[PDB]
């Protein structure tokens, strides 16, 4: 891929973000792409499991994940981020840092802060995982990322 | 590059690590490669400038830098690391984590801990920066990384 990009998953708890993230990785790998999944809880457990949940710790973790996605996306990798957070602030920061950025909002009918204008909105637990994956990939194609 | 790799600079303060790191980046970009430089102090200042200098904070920063290098190198990026530290422990951990790992020791005649068997040993200030860059690239070629 001449240009990598980030697929940033967001939605309330239970919407299916984690499942979709890993299914996207499996499919895009099968297709021959360079792909990495940045699962927030995995990264935390691997790099600083005892950092705590203070504000400063939460924003450091956010900056680390975002920087990991920025470097991976600018070097031709498809970066799938599943970073647990209800807040828009981290997602707006991520979009400012990562040039090629595709936000996937899984909508279910702190309080979850909805995005303004995500690249893709999917209704939770309606379509099969395969259809969710195909919908994300078609959006990436429409955006010129794939 | 079907396979990326890490160039890990080590040596005592003043040996010329930083100068070689940035010259290597400039040369490899001009050759058309995907390259990232992971400058330890730049990464600390960007991602967590107020983390402090405790043992836990030092080890967290080391793990972050190494994980960045690991993910970039496995995805076709030449990762040039210049992480200030006199200690072998971080370098041995990095080598265990990063499959394609090329250690470049700039030797100068809290105390610096020499590596056992680095892929390349350069005598500090003995050759021009251009010749140091060329020697690193030739070593990478000998190892089959380039
Ligand atoms: Cl495709
Ligand atoms: Cl070359």
Author numbering:
A (entry chain A), B (entry chain B): 16 to 124, 153 to 189
What does the study report here?
Methanothermococcus thermolithotrophicus is the only known methanogen that grows on sulfate as its sole sulfur source, uniquely uniting methanogenesis and sulfate reduction. Here we use physiological, biochemical and structural analyses to provide a snapshot of the complete sulfate reduction pathway of this methanogenic archaeon. M. thermolithotrophicus activates SO42− by conventional ATPS and APSK, but transforms it further by uncanonical enzymes.
(1b) Alternatively, APS can be further phosphorylated to 3′-phosphoadenosine 5′-phosphosulfate (PAPS) by the APS kinase (APSK). The APS-kinase model from M. thermolithotrophicus, MtAPSK, was refined to 1.77 Å. MtAPSK forms a homodimer with an organization very similar to bacterial enzymes, which was expected due to its high sequence conservation. Despite co-crystallization and soaking the crystals with APS and MgCl2, the MtAPSK structure was obtained in its apo state with a bound phosphate at the expected position of the ATP β-phosphate. The N terminus and region 125–152 (the latter being involved in substrate binding) could not be modelled due to the lack of electron density. However, the residues binding the substrates and Mg2+ are conserved, suggesting that MtAPSK should be functional, as confirmed by the coupled enzyme assay. The activity of the recombinantly expressed MtATPS and MtAPSK was tested via a coupled assay and a specific activity of 0.070 ± 0.004 µmol of oxidized NADH min−1 mg−1 of MtATPS was measured.
